């Protein structure tokens, strides 16, 4: 469920889930998929900034 | 492609001068009053609605009384629709008239009616099943259905298997029947053949579709 929500959120602004997780790993962001899906569902601006970090890292 | 509704009056014969007897059936044709003309714009298809016969006022609902009043006709015993085309919707106006003139002598017609009802019937009469042995040790299965399937494969009865059930009392059409004589002042339609149903039943006579 969390992975599906994060995939929806990342595709909403930018890249796919796989590239997003790679970008987080490169950015050294330790946030787990549970919190990530919670932010995707409940805080679209914060998830946008979080996606921008992963996108800047690749 | 439009027909008329009549009542089966019974069977008789017509003799020809050569001395051939023609089995005929007599149809009373009351006036077929036109109650509604259906067109493609309003209904999506073309049809003529007619009524024939009578009902007393106490037996006609307010909805049907208004339906008949809109046409300007008297309530009939039923209401019947005939699918038509632009050629058929020529002189046919609401409240108009359809008589036995619709058919000519020697014209082939299709006649539809409710068949005589035989009620619950076994396979022997309903489907021409063979009887099993009357003697020769036959137990209590003389008019039995016999086997109703195969073994484990398929392990069921196939749909549409012939069995006992209600026989007759269904809509049935007989095609290729000849108009022996038309009379319109008396509302007489004499047709060669059998005409499904009993005397007093509702019959529909249309031009023959085989042609």
């Amino acid at each position: 469920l969390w992975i599906a929500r994060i995939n929806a959120g990342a595709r909403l602004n930018g890249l796919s889930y796989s590239r997003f997780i790679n970008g987080m790993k490169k950015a050294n962001i330790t946030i787990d998929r549970r919190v990530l899906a919670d932010i995707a569902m409940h805080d679209a601006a914060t998830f946008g900034a979080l996606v921008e970090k992963a996108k800047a890292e690749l | 492609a439009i027909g008329l509704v009549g009542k089966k009056c019974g069977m008789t014969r017509v003799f020809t001068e050569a001395g051939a007897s023609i089995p005929v059936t007599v149809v009373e044709i009351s006036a077929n009053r036109i109650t509604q003309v259906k067109n493609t714009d309003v209904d999506g298809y073309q049809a003529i609605q007619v009524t024939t016969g009578t009902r007393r006022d106490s037996r006609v609902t307010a909805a049907q009384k208004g339906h008949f009043a809109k046409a300007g006709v008297a309530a009939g015993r039923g209401v019947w629709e005939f699918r038509a085309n632009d050629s058929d919707l020529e002189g046919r106006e609401i409240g108009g008239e359809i008589l036995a003139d619709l058919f000519e002598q020697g014209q082939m017609v299709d006649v539809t009616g409710n068949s005589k009802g035989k009620g619950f019937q076994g396979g022997v009469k309903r489907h021409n099943f063979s009887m099993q042995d009357a003697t020769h040790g036959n137990s209590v299965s003389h008019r039995a259905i016999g086997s109703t399937g195969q073994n484990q494969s398929p392990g069921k009865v196939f749909k549409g298997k012939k069995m006992p059930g209600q026989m007759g009392n269904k809509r049935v059409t007989v095609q290729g029947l000849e108009v022996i004589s038309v009379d319109v002042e008396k509302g007489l339609l004499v047709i060669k053949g059998a005409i499904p149903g009993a005397t007093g039943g509702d019959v529909i006579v249309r031009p023959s579709v085989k042609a």
Binding site: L1, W2, A4, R5, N7, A8, G9, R11, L12, R34, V35, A37, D38, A40, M41, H42, A44, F47 | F158, K159, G160
Partner: protein
């Protein structure tokens, strides 16, 4: 903190119009199936219908590649012994144009009450017009 579901009363289904003109049958069908399920939304929960209404026009103009227009077979059994019937993609496009895309999407949706409820949001029409200007669908090139 917990993981919340979408709360059907709080969900809104948006209306979109898709032109299936010359598009590949299955390539469009997958996109439509995802939209009907609601997988593009961050509130996606597999037990709630979070999808969107998809209105497909030019459904008779959808395309298949190869020799599939004449070799793609549609079988059905009528329930009667020997009652197996087959039709072509081209014959089915001539006869019931919407059924090609409806069949493709029904194959890709989950098979159960919720899937039946999500296929009910697919409004697909042969021709350039749909009777849903009241819903104001937004053009969606997918």
């Amino acid at each position: 903190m917990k993981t919340l579901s979408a709360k059907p009363a709080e969900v809104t289904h948006d209306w979109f119009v898709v032109d299936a003109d010359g598009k590949t049958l299955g390539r469009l069908a997958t996109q439509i199936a995802s939209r009907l399920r609601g997988k593009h939304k961050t509130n996606y929960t597999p037990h709630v219908d979070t999808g969107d209404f998809i209105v497909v026009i030019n459904a008779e103009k959808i395309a298949v590649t190869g020799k599939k227009a004449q070799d793609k077979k549609y079988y059905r059994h009528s329930g009667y012994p020997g009652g197996i019937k087959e039709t072509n993609f081209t014959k089915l496009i001539a006869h019931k144009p919407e059924d090609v895309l409806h069949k493709a999407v029904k194959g890709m949706l989950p098979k159960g009450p919720l899937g039946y409820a999500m296929i009910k949001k697919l409004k697909l029409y042969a021709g350039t017009d749909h009777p849903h200007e009241a819903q104001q669908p937004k053009e969606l090139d997918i």
